[PDB]
């Protein structure tokens, strides 16, 4: 496969929280105080993600912006659900493949997120200031269920019983 | 051509200060302050870029780590000339067809750099803390040659008269 010399190549590992596989490949010296963050930050953090058919991110959230880049393969289907309680999906890819795709997507902060893709897709995903477990979310099945009635179908398909 | 297809699509224009396309795509609501700068910055900023043959973009340098992020195309040659006088080159491109390439490359602060495709190369390139044009140098001919006498044939090359 050139999924399986993609993962030796960039050295990734399987990722906790999800269905894909990762590596952080970068972690800025410079560090910065924000409103909201509990203690200093990394200005700017960046990772290797990719993703197979049949297994979806399941739904998450953070306190910093989330932008995503397309290296390689088909599109990704990114699902959001906003703090209104309004649903949106943006398509990340190759627009001269899939006319309504583009390279770049930036998810916006305290957002719910996920992610499904058809075939395989290598993306480089940053976040700025940079990622601290402390700042980070899994969502839970009952308790998205209970805010956002109205979702419940795509919140069954992108998270764990 | 697909280049003119991508130029109209992403709606590039002509970058002032160099050979190659562009736009400024993303910057950060956060701001911070950080030592040797002159005032606050945005985190985080994000452009589009787009490289044809023949025309180098010609050395230059700034305050911040700037993270270069492959998307279509060839592979591009990244000039580098540390503080210490020593010279480096990093190749940004496809390891399934350019084995010694990687879709990621770092350019560490205060560095002069250059670069040059062989086909075209379209890229996203990030900056943090995000650009200012009082963080910005355009590099001298006869300044650099003047500090750098060993590497005067590259330096020829990649700079205008």
């Given at each position: 496969e050139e999924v399986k010399r993609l993962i030796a190549l960039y050295?990734?590992?399987?990722?906790?929280?999800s269905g894909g596989w990762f590596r952080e490949t970068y972690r800025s010296?410079?560090?910065?105080?924000?409103?909201?963050?509990?203690?200093?930050r990394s200005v700017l953090?960046?990772?290797?993600?990719?993703?197979?058919?049949?297994?979806?991110?399941?739904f998450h959230r953070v306190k910093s912006d989330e932008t995503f880049v397309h290296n390689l393969g088909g599109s990704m289907k990114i699902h959001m659900i906003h703090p209104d309680g309004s649903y949106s999906c943006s398509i990340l890819g190759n627009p001269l493949e899939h006319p309504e795709?583009?390279?770049?997507?930036?998810?916006?902060?305290?957002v719910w997120f996920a992610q499904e893709v058809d075939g395989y897709c290598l993306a480089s995903v940053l976040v700025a200031p940079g990622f601290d477990f402390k700042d980070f979310s899994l969502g839970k099945r009952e308790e998205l269920i209970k805010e956002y009635p109205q979702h419940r179908d795509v919140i069954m398909r992108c998270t764990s019983s």
């Amino acid at each position: 496969e050139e999924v399986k010399r993609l993962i030796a190549l960039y050295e990734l590992t399987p990722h906790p929280a999800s269905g894909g596989w990762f590596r952080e490949t970068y972690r800025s010296d410079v560090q910065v105080e924000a409103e909201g963050f509990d203690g200093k930050r990394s200005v700017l953090t960046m990772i290797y993600y990719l993703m197979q058919a049949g297994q979806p991110d399941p739904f998450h959230r953070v306190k910093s912006d989330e932008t995503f880049v397309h290296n390689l393969g088909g599109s990704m289907k990114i699902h959001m659900i906003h703090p209104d309680g309004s649903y949106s999906c943006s398509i990340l890819g190759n627009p001269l493949e899939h006319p309504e795709a583009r390279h770049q997507v930036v998810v916006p902060r305290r957002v719910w997120f996920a992610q499904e893709v058809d075939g395989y897709c290598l993306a480089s995903v940053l976040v700025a200031p940079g990622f601290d477990f402390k700042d980070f979310s899994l969502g839970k099945r009952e308790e998205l269920i209970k805010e956002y009635p109205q979702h419940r179908d795509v919140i069954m398909r992108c998270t764990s019983s």
